[PDB]
Structure 1
Amino acid sequence: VAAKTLLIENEDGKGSTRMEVQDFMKRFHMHASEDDKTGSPSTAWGTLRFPTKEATAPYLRLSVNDDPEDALLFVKAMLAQKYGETYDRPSLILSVTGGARNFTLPPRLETAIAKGLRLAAQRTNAWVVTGGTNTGVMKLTGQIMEALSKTQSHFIPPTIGIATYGVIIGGDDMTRGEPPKIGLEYEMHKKDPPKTTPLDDNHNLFLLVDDGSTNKFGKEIKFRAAFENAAGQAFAAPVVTIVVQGGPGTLGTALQAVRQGTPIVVVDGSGLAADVLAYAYNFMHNPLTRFKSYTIDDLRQKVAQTFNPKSSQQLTNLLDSALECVQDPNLVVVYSLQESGIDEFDDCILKAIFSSQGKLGNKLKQAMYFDQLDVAKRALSEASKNGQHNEIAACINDNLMAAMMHNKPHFVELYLGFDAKIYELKPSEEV
């Protein structure tokens, strides 16, 4: 009852070729020690069975030097095997990052962020990428998708957890054994000696990135950002990072996100690091009257009280990284939960999507998913004034097709009014 061959998608993106599992998986490396650079074969991949969960979750321990596209094909190969060739492609990648332990928040605020995230996830069929550990905002997001999983008929959206290997109590268990492990018991309550951080039982996949160390965090940040960028280019979907509370590595995650072109949405009033990022963005870009008293000194005081760098050089690097995140005003969208309305978080997510680099038609399709007719109308009017008639005519047909499939009559009237010939609509597949 175990797979022997897998359908790995070709680099051309036109079809899937069938190849042996050991042949595809040979390209993934492991480090026996910190000193090692070239490495040895990994052999730690399979599925984990968690208590009170019906479905099993695949896991792969891979190295920092491994290609993130290869990992993307690997994820595509599992989904293609399990759900068939015509599985539901993602139109949104939702990355949830933040505090692992320091995440303390009031229940109403938590309920509001959870409610907005649940609605966005259920309307857009988004792939949510969080941490692989059983703590904080990642565990909370896991609980949200746990409740989400008891609906939507057959298909369940994946909850990918990317975590640094070396902190996992069941690390010895996935090392010991032969390369295939289909049913393996995971014991989160077992007292394992040199490690204390368990995996979240509600995550549907796991990528444990290893570089050779024990009890060291943050080694998977660059690969996670690169993997999101690779997924975003492959599925033509915008990637939106969300920053709720967070520590120093969340700042580094945001720095990686803004360097790789991925937009971020910082929820102001939800935490310390979020307040620092929101404060920096509001100081550099916001034209409102109440932000004119913002200074570098108060920002430096906020960084010192939040991150506790101990030394001036560390404080300078943290301050520089925080200022480097909010350099480009398009890539950061700040949602003020404690000031603005309850139902404007999806508008902030949509603003980040529209400010990102992507085609206009896909963004209109994304706007159609969130049911924001006014945003699409304003975008269409702005697009109409700025010329670019060839790209609008090239994407209007598929946007109209998407509008027909997803039951949006107001959107069909909109798209049909902007010179869309009714008889030039085309099907997605080939007959």
Structure 2
Amino acid sequence: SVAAKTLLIENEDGKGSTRMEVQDFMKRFHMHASEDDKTGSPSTAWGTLRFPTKEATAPYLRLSVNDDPEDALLFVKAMLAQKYGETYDRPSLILSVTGGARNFTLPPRLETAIAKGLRLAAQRTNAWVVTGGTNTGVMKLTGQIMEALSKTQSHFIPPTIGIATYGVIIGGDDMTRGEPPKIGLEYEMHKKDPPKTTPLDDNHNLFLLVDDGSTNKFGKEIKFRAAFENAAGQAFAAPVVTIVVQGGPGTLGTALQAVRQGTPIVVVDGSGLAADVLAYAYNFMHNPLTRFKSYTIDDLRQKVAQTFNPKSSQQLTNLLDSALECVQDPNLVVVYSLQESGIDEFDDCILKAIFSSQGKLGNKLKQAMYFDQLDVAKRALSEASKNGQHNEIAACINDNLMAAMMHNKPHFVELYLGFDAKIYELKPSEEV
């Protein structure tokens, strides 16, 4: 339709948005014409892509490796602010989906459980889902899960942000050429692009194409993706939860990076490969059940050797050492398994990962309210009460009661009112 000329970019104070011209704001993103180039030129590749059989268009931004992730975060906030107004539903959860690049088939019960839990978590927390954005494997699977969410729900649809390396994407030249922005640009996934062979997933709602001037090289967007998730987590005061489904050797290093920075991970057991390796390793080191007493480092080494097939013994030793290093802290890894947890317990695993993360008690009570787990909130309040954190309970009880009233949770309203919270002492969030 009519191309946008002005955008509401949020101020650094976090209290207001200023209206400014689109060409003025978008100048800060750079692109590289070739690998040799370092400084670059301003990006002419941004706009919206129209995918066949999809009603809505997805914004795309091609940005350099040296660009600030806060600027990209401002761009995503500006798109959401433009489409849904200034008072759009802020995310209380960032869901990072990592795993296998190549295509894989999962069992129907397991797929149904992952799909149901991810949809419930995304619709209850208005979560930002960050994946790789290509039309293969876990990214395509996550897109398929969120496709039903975009159909069954009206007004706000939780974003499926795809952060991909620009050098492998089919149709990059078509996206680059022209005068920006490109309103409703047709994306031809079946068009024969000669050097590149990886297309974008049509179910992702927003695209960040990270460019370094290289062609047909993967893994260039990992650091920016991690930085963007951390930046989003600091900005919205929301936990970042990584989800690991299948995965190769680099997924192990990605999970290792996630657990070293304090970010919790949810490992899907039974999906095969690196997820099975991570799940075995945790179960070997931490799980007290009987069927995990026969687990050994030798059988784990055999499992790593049969799945990842290393060339050398030293490579196998390093992979085994890294896998054991990821599950050192039992709080930061949550393993979801069908034969132990249950079909309708994946969202509970996501909530346990949220509670195991670093955050304030009031925010954790709000997350427990969103998932409708009254027992978890009762246990958290009792544990906080026993450990001498009564001051934080009294400090957050008013805001928790307010949040419980807004999100239609009457049992939580009764629970918060029972712990000496006066009804006539409520306070508004903003200042009149």
Taking structure 2 as the reference length, the TM-score comes to 0.94
Deviation at 1:376, TM superposition (A): 0.5
Q: CA deviation at 1:332?
A: 0.6
Question: Counterpart of 2:225?
Answer: 224
Q: 1:319 to 1:33 in 2, by over 3 A?
A: farther
TM-aligned CA distance change 1:189 to 1:124, over 3 Å: same
Is 1:270 aligned with 2:271? yes
1:108–1:389 Cα change, 3 Å: closer
How many Å apart are 1:313 and its aligned residue?
Answer: 4.3
Which deviations, in whole Å up to 9, do the C-alpha atoms of 1:206-260 show, x marking residues without a partner? Answer: 0111223222211111211221111111111112111111122322321232233
Give per-residue Cα distances to partners, 1:21-64, cap 9 Å, x unaligned. 23332222223333333333222111001111111110011122
CA distance in 1, matches of 2:30, 2:115: 37
Contact 1:160 1:203 in 2 (8 A): yes
1:167-187 alpha-carbon deviations (Å, 9 max, x no partner): 111111112222321121100
Q: Please give the alpha-carbon distance, in whole angstroms, between the structure 2 residues aligned to 1:310 and 1:37.
A: 36
2:403 alignment partner in structure 1? 402
Unaligned runs of 5+ in 1: none
**Cα contact 1:269–1:338 (8 A) shared by 2:** no
Select between 196-205 and 313-322 the one with higher mean Cα deviation. 313-322
Helix, strand or coil for the counterpart of 2:168? coil
Once the two structures are TM-superposed, the CA of residue 358 in structure 1 deviates from its matched residue by 0.7
Please say if residues 229 and 262 of structure 1, whose CA atoms lie closer than 8 Å, have aligned partners that are also in contact: no
The structural deviation recorded for 1:299 is: 2.6
Change (3 A) 1:319 1:145: same
TM-superposed deviation, 1:289: 4.0
Aligned residues: percent identity?
100
Helix, strand or coil: the match of 2:244? strand
Whole-Å separation in 1 of the counterparts to 2:215 and 2:313: 28
Structure 1 residues 285-296: aligned runs within 5 Å? 285-296=286-297
1:362 corresponds to 2:363: yes
The residue matched to 1:95 in structure 2 has which SS? strand
Which is further off, 94-103 or 402-411?
A: 94-103
After TM superposition, the runs of 4+ consecutive aligned structure 1 residues lying more than 6 A away are none
Instruction: Answer whether contact 2:113 2:346 (CA < 8 A) is retained.
Output: no
Contact 1:68–1:230 (CA under 8 A) maintained in structure 2: yes
Deviation (angstroms), 1:347: 1.6
**3-state secondary structure, aligned to 2:291:** helix
Instruction: Give CA-to-partner distance per residue, 1:325-368, whole Å, 9 cap, x none.
Output: 22222111111123332122222111110000011111111111
| Counterpart contact for 1:267–1:337, Cα < 8 Å | no
1:185-207 CA-partner distances (Å, limit 9, x unpaired): 10011111111111111111001
Change (3 A) 1:78 1:414: same
The equivalent residue for 2:380 is 379
Q: Which whole-Å CA distance do the structure 2 matches of 1:36 and 1:318 have between them?
A: 35
CA deviation vs aligned residue, 1:268-299 (integer Å, no higher than 9, x gap): 11221111011122223333444344333333
Distance 1:184 1:410, change over 3 A: same
Q: Is the deviation greater in 256-265 or in 395-404?
A: 256-265
Bigger CA drift: 61-70 or 23-32? Answer: 23-32
Matched residue, 2:418: 417
Q: Distance in 2 between matches of 1:425 and 1:40?
A: 53
Shift of residue 416, structure 1, vs aligned partner: 1.4
* Aligned counterparts of 2:33 and 2:256: Cα–Cα separation in 1: 30
What are the superposed Cα offsets for residues 144-167 of structure 1, whole Å, 9 maximum, x if unpaired? Answer: 221111233322221111111111
8 A contact 2:117–2:347 mirrored in 1 = yes
Query: d(CA) in 2 for partners of 1:200 and 1:385?
Result: 49
Query: Which range is displaced more, 127-136 or 49-58?
Result: 127-136
Indicate the SS of the match to 1:55.
coil
* Stretch of structure 1 that moved more, 68-77 or 133-142: 133-142
Q: Secondary structure of 2:122's partner?
A: helix
| 1:94-152 deviation line (CA, Å, top 9, x unaligned) | 22222232422222321222122222222222222222111122222212221111233
2-side partners of 1:135 and 1:167: how far apart?
13
Instruction: Give yes or no for contact 1:8–1:17 (8 Å, CA) kept in 2.
Output: yes
CA distance in 1, matches of 2:160, 2:343: 25
Alpha-carbon shift at residue 428 of structure 1 (Å): 2.6
In 1: Cα distance, 2:91 partner to 2:381 partner? 24
Q: Is the 8 A contact 1:229 1:260 kept in 2?
A: no
Q: Is the Cα contact below 8 Å between 2:116 and 2:344 reproduced in 1?
A: no
Question: Do the aligned partners of residues 307 and 41 (structure 1) sit closer, same or farther apart at CA in structure 2, a change above 3 Å counting?
Answer: farther
Q: Could you tell me how far 1:68 is from its partner in structure 2?
A: 1.2
CA contact (8 A) 1:8 1:73 kept: yes
Q: 1:276 to 1:165 in 2, by over 3 A?
A: same
Structural RMSD (CA): 1.8
* Partner Cα distance (1:412, 1:372) in 2: 13
SS at match of 1:279: helix
Determine if contact 2:50/2:58 at 8 Å carries over to the other structure.
yes
Query: For the residues of structure 1 that align with 2:312 and 2:21, how far apart are their CA atoms?
Result: 53
8 Å CA contact 2:103, 2:136 repeated in 1? no
CA contact (8 A) 2:150 2:157 kept: yes
Q: Is the 8 A contact 2:165 2:209 kept in 1?
A: yes
Instruction: Name the structure 1 match of 2:74.
Output: 73
